Symmetry: D2
Subunit: 269 residues, 4 copies
Amino acid sequence: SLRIRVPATTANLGPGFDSCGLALTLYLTLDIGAEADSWYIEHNIPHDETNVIIETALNLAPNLTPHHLVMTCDIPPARGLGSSSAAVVAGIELANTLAELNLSKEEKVRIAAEIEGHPDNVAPAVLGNWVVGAKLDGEDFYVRHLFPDCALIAFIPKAELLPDTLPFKEAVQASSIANVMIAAILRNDMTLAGEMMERDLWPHLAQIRDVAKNQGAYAACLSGAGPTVLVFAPRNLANKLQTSLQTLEIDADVLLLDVEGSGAEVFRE
Amino acid sequence: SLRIRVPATTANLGPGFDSCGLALTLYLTLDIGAEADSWYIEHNIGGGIPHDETNVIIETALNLAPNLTPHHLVMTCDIPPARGLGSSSAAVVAGIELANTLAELNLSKEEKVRIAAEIEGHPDNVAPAVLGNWVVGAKLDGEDFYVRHLFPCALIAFIPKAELLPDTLPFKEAVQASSIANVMIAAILRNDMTLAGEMMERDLWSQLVPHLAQIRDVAKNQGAYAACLSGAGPTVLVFAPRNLANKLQTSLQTLEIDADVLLLDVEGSGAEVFREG
Amino acid sequence: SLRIRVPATTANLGPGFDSCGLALTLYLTLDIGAEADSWYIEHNIPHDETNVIIETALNLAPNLTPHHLVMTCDIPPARGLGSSSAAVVAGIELANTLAELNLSKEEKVRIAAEIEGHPDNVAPAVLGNWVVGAKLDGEDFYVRHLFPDCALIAFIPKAELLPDTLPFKEAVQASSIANVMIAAILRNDMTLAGEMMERDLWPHLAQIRDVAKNQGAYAACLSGAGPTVLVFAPRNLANKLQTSLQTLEIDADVLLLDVEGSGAEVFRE
Amino acid sequence: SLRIRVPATTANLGPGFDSCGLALTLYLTLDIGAEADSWYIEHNIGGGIPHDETNVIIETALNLAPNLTPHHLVMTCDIPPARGLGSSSAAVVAGIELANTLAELNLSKEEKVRIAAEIEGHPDNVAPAVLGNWVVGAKLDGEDFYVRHLFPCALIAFIPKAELLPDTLPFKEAVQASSIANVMIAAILRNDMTLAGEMMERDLWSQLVPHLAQIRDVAKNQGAYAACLSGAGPTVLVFAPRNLANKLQTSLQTLEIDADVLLLDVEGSGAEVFREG
């Protein structure tokens, strides 16, 4: 059967607020069954046409023949890991395929960003790897790059229970930190990048940072708006940082992740 | 004799305000002479550029090394003062190199940048003046962080005469201006100078301004990337593929704008201290 | 209908002989029709099961239900632009899809390289963009990178009508030129890279070089084993180099090409 | 006083034969004294390292500047001679810097590399000694081409005592060895030091060799990238993530191999000439 797989994404990377996004090896995967009188989705969030994926697909191609689907998703909802981004992207993939739109990837990002308000999760979800973006009156501009080899450790706690202006000088400083972070990543200088990443001028964070940084992690920052914390580290520290973070006795899932090099895929299994 | 050479720089590259800057092939050259009763600099730069201890170079030098023995010096400088090409910042860097050499401070490049940025209040002329090439920087009360990258490009400078004479930003505006500089930096590193040039032309954060659209039209219609004010102005820089440099100079010279049209390259080397006959 | 698109590739890039390959915006595209008693392919090279695509697919999945297909290919055969590579890759795509193998891309390259003897065309054809490869007793090792933005001009003449050892010192020099070429490309230093590219130590070339280099092209080298010549240039020179090369009155197609960022794709149109 | 400092280098990185090399945090330091009747270098380096005009540094200097006035000099050097860490090449570079400074030749970095490579017969110690960091080079009868990149890494050096004491290749073998260095270079630039380290360990083109497998087993089983001969040997270098440096040193010291186990870093700066008190 036709399958659609879309990865988690972390947006912001600290000072890259609303600009940088990175795709991760955690996935929303769909499995398309036969045609039918109505939309349904077998899963473990609406099971019918009201589901984001379907509303999105129907927005692109209103006349899609309904289908039954099966959905598996190891991206936790409302946790800053691009669940919602991944669902919207899947919906774009659904329609592109069933109605044979043959959309360019540049097109799928434009559509996704417009739906979402912001391009920072959806561009990497479509394109894979690391995407540096901007929305300037009307259009998206983005550049894709290959993130340096490193390990990621996702400290994923439970879902959350719940400025107008900025002084010129502080705005400037915030932009230049993002600037240096980006230049540093592009030099494979993960030490300096990590140090910029933790200076986000725009809970448990200080703890996870103290622990990870003291063993040689590059950085620990909020993924998107949170509450998951992402640790960037040398590979040889991945297992040991996981173990060390698990000791904190906080109620959380501690995962080993990589950068997902490929974006949304449609394939048969 | 002992010589100190420091390059011109163009700062505030696109929305890289107080962040991005680029060293250029114009130079402040000092030739250090004999010890003496007091400081003198021989030069013919004109304007109100002093020849004594009040010259920026010397005050900067004495600020790092108060107890220095004075010298006579000879100065060549084809970086026009107050023209947006980092004349002021080259002089500060030159004073740092003077003190560092004559008082044997053995400062690292890192310390020299830190020191020059503290003096100037921003890092984006001084870091490329010390480090060469293209520097992305941040001065964050306390310290300086910077990355040096290779800029891909020739530059055509409209250099006019010296000029005769925002408190707060909406959050969203600041976020957006940041994202444009981010994209500019990322694009440069794909060698996508077309996209970079497009980002570089947005401001978001003088005499040649009313001719900017016209300079753009002409330059970009032949394949130039962008035309921008250099730093705070008033010089305008046109960024262009290297193969286009000569023909772009000639072409822009036909506009008969009141400015010298000069061809500059990216200068890869920062400030140097060396012996030459 | 399900479509498969696979790009042209240039291998060698001079001193990167048997190691570097780059995907280009010229394509072999397949269009899969309904099932049938036998394989057939409508095209403008075998029309039946003997076709490379089909022999390859059947090698992966011997039990594929036969199909009718339509094939469009603007890659010229036997011209050093990876026609044959592209057909083999298409065949891999065919089987992966029809028999639902869900092969990883790493797998498709391994399979393709094994069929071909060498990984230098097939890896970029699968992976897209620029691939630096090696075959070391048993396995492939390759790294993908993003080739610097530039324009390509393919001087494509007609099909061709038709050492054991190397002194230590010359071998070393050849490797170090490739080394410097690669380091240069990775610094976005296309001037130095082009100058290394033209020093390949392992007809019409000298002419095309004199013409292209004298206007500011980075380089002109044989694509694969030839006879097409590829010119690498600043973008603003693309149109004018095309026009200038067309004046040579040689019997050739002069094309404007880009680096294809994406590898083989399977999609509906 | 006038000082010249030049770093150690490890060349022949993987199959980057006569091509790839890397500057390291060990130094040859010269302190230049008064003009004199003849050359003398004060030092306690041992071996047959001369103190007069026959010392490599001085012969190199006189070869660029025959008419130089002699000086007395003081030499500190913690790069062990003939140990595969570019002792010889640091001395040649130091002589170039001496002549360039005392005869005011004002040679560019490019010319200094060209000159040092011509003297040594290969560029892969001397280019990183001049340029710093990691240099990929080619010496192609006539000229030199090189690219400087940032190496990602700490190094653990097994430095033993000085050692007590192919004409042609099958085409296919040469092509393959080239492809391995190509991959090594490409992998380094993805920050994939695991893959790089794997390529770096293949030869294709002394005293510590029989312990190499053992050093590998131990180092790589804790997360090191690779263990290789440095240049022609005899020192062995272990390449490892920086966070592992200290614990790797300690760990490798338990093998009780007859060699000093030293911790080195990548040195970013090439040869420097500077004043210090």
